[PDB]
Amino acid sequence: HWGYGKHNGPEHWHKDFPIAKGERQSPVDIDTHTAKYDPSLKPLSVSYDQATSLRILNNGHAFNVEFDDSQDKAVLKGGPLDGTYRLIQFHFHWGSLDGQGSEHTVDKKKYAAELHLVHWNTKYGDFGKAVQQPDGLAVLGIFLKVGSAKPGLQKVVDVLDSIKTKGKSADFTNFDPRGLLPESLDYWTYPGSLTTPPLLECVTWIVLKEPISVSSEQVLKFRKLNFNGEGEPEELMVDNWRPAQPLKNRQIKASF
Ligand SMILES: NS(=O)(=O)c1cc2c(s1)S(=O)(=O)N(Cc1cccs1)C[C@@H]2O
Ligand SMILES: [Hg+2]
Ligand SMILES: [Zn+2]
């Protein structure tokens, strides 16, 4: 079924998920000159102090770190949002080379990877109900550039070896997501969708201005993952990103 290869890649998704051609699809190019500064946007409130991570899983398209979302432990509020959004998982999209891998681009600049911390609106009771709503999810996206190593990232990198293939998971408790944030919380925001099937248009996207840098040996580890399951032919998990979709009459507001 879907994936990122020539035969089942982004350009084929519309056949099974017609919403791929919809009106608020993601990712988009952020054009910094056309984004409107909106001084009514409140500051973001990232409360990741009580975060409880549980495990890391290679799901065949990325690896996800799942968090216990049964109580308001790690939440996002403020910014463009109304209400409390709970952290449920985070994952990355990366490239086969350092010049590609982000999903969102800024003035057409692609970064080496992009981190998505996925939150759902607690108003709706569970994640499944939240993906039925136009303001059901908020994903915080952070660009990664290659430079110095990110200390907070290394714990994830050291575990990727035990989850090499599709369907492996490993326990991964006590990871603190705060070590993945940039210094500044300045952002662009716009209404959008999930960037992988089922491509539902449930998401308020918050994309931070400031990228974090990771080393080349750290992103190199990402690239060793496999799309396939154990015993299947090896396909390296690289380039698991969707190209920018048309903005078609949405405006990207900026908090700065
Ligand atoms: N790339 S991205 O940030 O826009 C996201 C992709 C996926 C996300 S967020 S999800 O965890 O919410 N989930 C979506 C759903 C699961 C069940 C019903 S819909 C898995 C998706 O692959
Ligand atoms: Hg929706
Ligand atoms: Zn994503």
State the Cα–Cα distance between residues 215 and 147, nearest whole angstrom.
Answer: 5
| 93 assigned to a ligand binding site | yes
Positions marked catalytic: 61
How big is the CA angle at 214 (ends 27 and 65), to the nearest 5 degrees? 65
CA 194 to ligand 1 centroid distance, Å: 6
Atom 21 of ligand 1, nearest CA residue: 196
Q: Residue 226 gets which letter from DSSP?
A: B
Which among 98, 62, 102, 90 is positioned nearest to 241, based on CA atoms? 102
Contact criterion met (CB below 8 Å) for 17 and 199 = yes
Which among 1, 65, 2 is positioned nearest to 240, based on CA atoms? 2
Method: X-ray
Greatest C-alpha distance within the chain: 55
- The resolution of the experimental structure, rounded to one decimal in Å, is 2.2
State the Cα–Cα distance between residues 157 and 163, nearest whole angstrom.
Answer: 11
How big is the CA angle at 218 (ends 213 and 220), to the nearest 5 degrees? 115
Strand pairing partners for 29? 105
Omega prior to 27 cis, within 30 of 0 = yes
Measured from the Cα of 61, ligand 1's closest atom is: 22
Site residues for ligand 1, CB cut-off 6 Å: 89, 116, 118, 131, 139, 194-196, 198
State the Cα–Cα distance between residues 67 and 55, nearest whole angstrom.
Answer: 7
Atom 13 of ligand 1, nearest CA residue: 194
| 189 assigned to a ligand binding site | no
The CA–CA distances, whole Å, from 25 to 31, 188, 198, 222 equal: 16, 16, 11, 26
Which ligand sits closest to the CA of 193? 1
CA 203 to ligand 2 centroid distance, Å: 7
Measured from the Cα of 195, ligand 1's closest atom is: 4
CA 235 to ligand 3 centroid distance, Å: 20
Which among 216, 198, 250 is positioned nearest to 97, based on CA atoms? 216
CA 177 to ligand 2 centroid distance, Å: 26
Which tokens in the block code for residue 74? Answer: 């790690």
List the domains of the chain with CATH numbers.
1-256 (3.10.200.10)
State the Cα–Cα distance between residues 206 and 37, nearest whole angstrom.
Answer: 14
Give the 3-state secondary structure of residue 244. coil
φ, ψ for residue 176 (rounded to 5)? -105, 115
The CA–CA distances, whole Å, from 115 to 11, 133, 157, 233 equal: 23, 23, 14, 28
Measured from the Cα of 200, ligand 1's closest atom is: 19
Strand-pair category, 113-121 with 105-106 = unpaired
Which tokens in the block code for residue 140? Answer: 């915080």
State the Cα–Cα distance between residues 256 and 217, nearest whole angstrom.
Answer: 33
State the Cα–Cα distance between residues 176 and 215, nearest whole angstrom.
Answer: 19
